[PDB]
Amino acid sequence: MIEIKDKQLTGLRFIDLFAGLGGFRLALESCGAECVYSNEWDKYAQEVYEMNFGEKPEGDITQVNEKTIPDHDILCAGFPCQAFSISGKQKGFEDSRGTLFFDIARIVREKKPKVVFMENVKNFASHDNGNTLEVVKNTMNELDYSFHAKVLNALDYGIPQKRERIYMICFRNDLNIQNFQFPKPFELNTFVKDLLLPDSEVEHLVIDRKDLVMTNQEIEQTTPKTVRLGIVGKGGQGERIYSTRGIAITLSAYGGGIFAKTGGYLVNGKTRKLHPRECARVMGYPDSYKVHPSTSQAYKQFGNSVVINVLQYIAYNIGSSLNFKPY
Template sequence: MIRTIDLFAGIGGIRLGFEQAWGKANDQTVFVSEWDKYAKQTYETNFGDTPPVDGDITKISADAIPPFDICLAGFPCQAFSLAGKREGFADDYYGQTRGTLFREVVRICKVHQPKVIFCENVKGLVHHDKGRTLQVIEGAFTEIGYKVFAKVLNSQYFGVPQNRERIYLVCFRNDIAPAEFNWPTGSEPTTKIRDILDPAPIPPKYYLSSVYLETLRRHKERHQSMGHGFGYEVRDLDGIAGTIMVGGMGRERNLIIDHRPHSTTPTTHIKGSINSEDIRKMTPREWARLQGFPDDYRLEQADTHLYKQLGNSVSVPVIRAIASQIKEVIDK
């Protein structure tokens, strides 16, 4: 039995990947922390409330956390994201410095000395502050007794149709650390957007209004005239999606044309009519499939919350592949 803790847990994507790799019966989560109340609700809907999801990790003593073998930590990435201001350690969000929250992982693991620390973050962390930010983070884990392996992997090579590059850190305690860590390589992409679509008919609320579509077109033309690449994008159903973004942004960067029969009668208040070109945004369930969540993973909140949660989450198949390689080291 491997005991894990799930810090900055979101909706549990990292935990799910580890459970899939290790076998749910062999993976016991003994502590969970997530401060977003809506993410907590989705987490508990799918994993139950044992252990309960604790809130602000900065207010929890390391001694209050049960002993554990693996620390899972998707610490906040907005401070390093190319889509954000990239303020790093100086980032401030409602009084909380998100860029320094990795230190909470260090604080807890320094006391408990688990076998493995696993972290996920945006690719922007690699080059943030000319690489110095990543050096600080790796150095902190090294200082408390860990050998750090880091790698950028792209989700599209692990069975999901999404171009999503993320950096993963696997830190082994020095006494069990291997000389090298065999990162999974994945395989050539075969899954396409077409493969993850919901069955028709898609509710009309997901189809853009004619007025909003025209607004998006004018916005894109305005930026193109200035030499920018901003604006909406319609994806090829036989291609892959762009990165679904932190905070749920990017819905307009992953529009699709879906000609299958559907109602053209609006069910929400919109300006104009439903567009005649059959352009729509993807549904939350389709976003979940872009992240590799199984269809029995329950999505029971309003779309606004679900888009945010899924955009902030991880690609489960990538986590599963890395967790399988970690298991090989631990088994040896």
């Protein structure tokens, strides 16, 4: 994550829905905002969240009375994506976990915040011939909000990871906000190698498999893209090996394969998956952030989380627009 000198959200309160690790909180608080409520139902996530922020998020949002939610200016929500991701069954709203957006919609109806800040995977944008994104657009447009939606790739914002996500920013219409803009991409000068831990600390992650097959020579020059070097087994998800000179593939939450949830990398002649700390770094989390004691849950947590830096630039731009009120 980045240092923010000009706090654009000072004095504003926000809600951290589907909190997970608290990525949205880190991003918004770094801009000067105050979190007044958090919600997350996974026991392990609640444990890490509490370990880092001192509070336990409230449980199952589907059974929380919206009138109970504290007044706030900004609603944050990286809602579930299993139902829309290119990696899943794409059941959408018909999935037991694909209707969470409507829980957001009904919170917005009751609390009517100044801004609604949501996040989800890239495929959400095209899922079901684009009908799902339109349902969200109309739902917000009808709750009386504008709808700014764009797909940003983390590699365009200082973080070496090919994580493409759709970011949705909605302003209450009375706040005639007509100058919101998504952050402008800039050159990437940090790569996977720059974030790795010393070999002594990751020896246990090294995998040596007879069916390891290198298909491409290691690259000498850093590039802002993923570069596959080899594969293990059939080369399905989590069986692919990349160059640390390029960028990291998308970390996942339920991912399988020998290099489950992080993918494999060629480091000093050895192939290994990333350490939870490196995942934290690949996601833009500061080293001060405490990871969960269960490595598997830690990978899962960072897996469906958000890249803090991207959130920061957007959050900064949200406050910039909110603060431009000339006479």
